[PDB]
Amino acid sequence: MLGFLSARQTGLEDPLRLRRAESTRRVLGLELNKDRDVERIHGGGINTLDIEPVEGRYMLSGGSDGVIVLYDLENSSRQSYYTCKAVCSIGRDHPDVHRYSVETVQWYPHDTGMFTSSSFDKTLKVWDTNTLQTADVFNFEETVYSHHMSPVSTKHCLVAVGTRGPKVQLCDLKSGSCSHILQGHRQEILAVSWSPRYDYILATASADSRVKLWDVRRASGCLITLDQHNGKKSQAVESANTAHNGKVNGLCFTSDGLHLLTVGTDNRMRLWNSSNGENTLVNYGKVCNNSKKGLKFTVSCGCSEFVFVPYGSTIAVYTVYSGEQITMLKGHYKTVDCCVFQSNFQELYSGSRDCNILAWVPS
Template sequence: MLGFLTARQAGVDDPLRLRRVESTRRVLSLKLNPDRDVDRIHGNGINTIDIEAVEGRYMLSGGADGVIVIYDLENFGGKQQYTCKAVSTVGSRHVHKFSVETVQWYPYDTGMFISSSFDKTMKVWDTETLKVMKVPDRLLPSALSLPLSFSLFSASCVLTFPCHKVPYGHRAEVLSVRWSPRYEHILASASADSQVKVWDVRRASCSLLTLDQHNGDKSKASSEAVNTAHNGRVNGLCFSGDGLYLLTTGTDDRMRLWNSATGENTLVNYGKVCNESRKRLQFTVSRGCSPEFVFVPCGSSVAVYALHTGQLVTMLRGHYNNVDCCEFHPDYQELYSGGKDCNILAWVPVLRASDVEEESDRCGRTALVNPAFQDAWSSDED
């Protein structure tokens, strides 16, 4: 680390390189923090969480009990041991009739957030009053063009646009939708029909791409004429931080990495990625690291993979039941995960010298055969 600081001061190294290296070190040292608790409010499993991007201070959660909770992640006491307090809770009769499946902050202001549910409704909330806002119809098109991510559970018709030739929308329920962080008019949808489609919301025509796991090789495809991304329900989507790649997960226990511009399956092998959920699975990608990492719920653990090599880096274990969602905090390289045990756990960098030395040893050996790790774990001898 001293070598990086010296190189930065001398103008030899780009300051961003030091930031990438330190971010990577922190991600590789994530541990369950015994000194940080999150208020246990939900009486049933936690389906979704989201951290606002303005201050990085407030977190939303939505549960199978139909409850939405807002937490304050800030440590005001200054003590090492503290609890992230629930500052607001909205009970089930005021929120949704059934399980809350997604919550999402408005990206430019913490004064508004959005929720969706199995009751086939999506609601826009005023954070101060915790009441549902009435959004004029004329504002809906601009609101929907924001870089927000929702899961839609009503029917395949949600993402079906008019087409003069043939029907081309999903043939089963849409389980997950994600907006591209690179282009605000591009979104991807995943469905129980085994398909993933990429859409341009400015066009009243068919989807731009339908992802094909076989990259057009019909000899490997089934007898069906349609392209499939997985051999089962596709219940998870996530773009890389730069929007150049799209990750998908399915009930075939596979995760695939796609070129988001061409729709090409990059054929990165992540091995078996256990996925028994019939609903949306919320996973996330790190930010500012080199290489990037992906955090995926896998049973009662969170699996951490190198994004572009598929290498399983570690398993984060701490939940007592299946994990359904996780969210990465890019400001502090922390991870929050929620599951069916009704707990939200905080995973934070543990940078004790012994831990870093042990992790450096392990990843240093990996770097010998995997150049992607060399930036993060290069020697400080210079």
């Protein structure tokens, strides 16, 4: 590493080299945090986490008990040991608390003054973070499994919602219009994710073992349907062209948005060319998941790319483009529901059914 510093000082290597190499080295040295703790407030398992995209300081967490906790991750104390204190809380005494489990919570991109939370109580609530009051509510005829706002859209502010209905709802923040729907799936839509690269590209994964990419501006259904075999087993499109041999319960675009990682209940993760949906045939081995709802997993950013997938009661870290298994982060006592990656310091926060949020820091 002194070689890295010397090369940076002498201009031999771009500082990009040291930055990304050290980010990768930090991610590889991920371990149970020696001096860090997260305050425990959820009475039930944490189903979702979200660190705000700008300044990466505050973290939302939705629990199976319906409460939403807002933590400050910064060590505002002077000690080397600190607990990520809870700033705010939609608790059981809040007038607008979710009646059932919160399954997805997401900070509004471009601004930390608002966030959103969807629950199995058939509601997507939009909260003002300052007053901590519901600015808007979007009711659905069937329970919400996931939702996502575009991390890129300066123009549109649509929330793509996947419920147990076979339709992907698009709730417009502007002129409150939840009527827009996308047809083409056949069972519950367990995951939805906007492309970080393209403004109007949305990937949706449903229990019909299919993943569809939509240009929501378009009037002609999905753009691409992901196919495991790319055409080896080709059939008229009524039941073929499946992404997995089970329910596809997790989506994650890579950092650049040029590839898509789909995890399904066939104990398989697959990497897809996001421009034509071709399977890249990256192996990843066997990725154990049996979750009946959406599975939240994230990818690394700003490194020389990693994907952190909940794997039983562990976090499996894989190399996205080679599939090589890095490691198992092993500190949870029950199945891990979500993991969210802090890209500023290569940190990880994992929420599981054991009512714990565990922080993994580079050693």
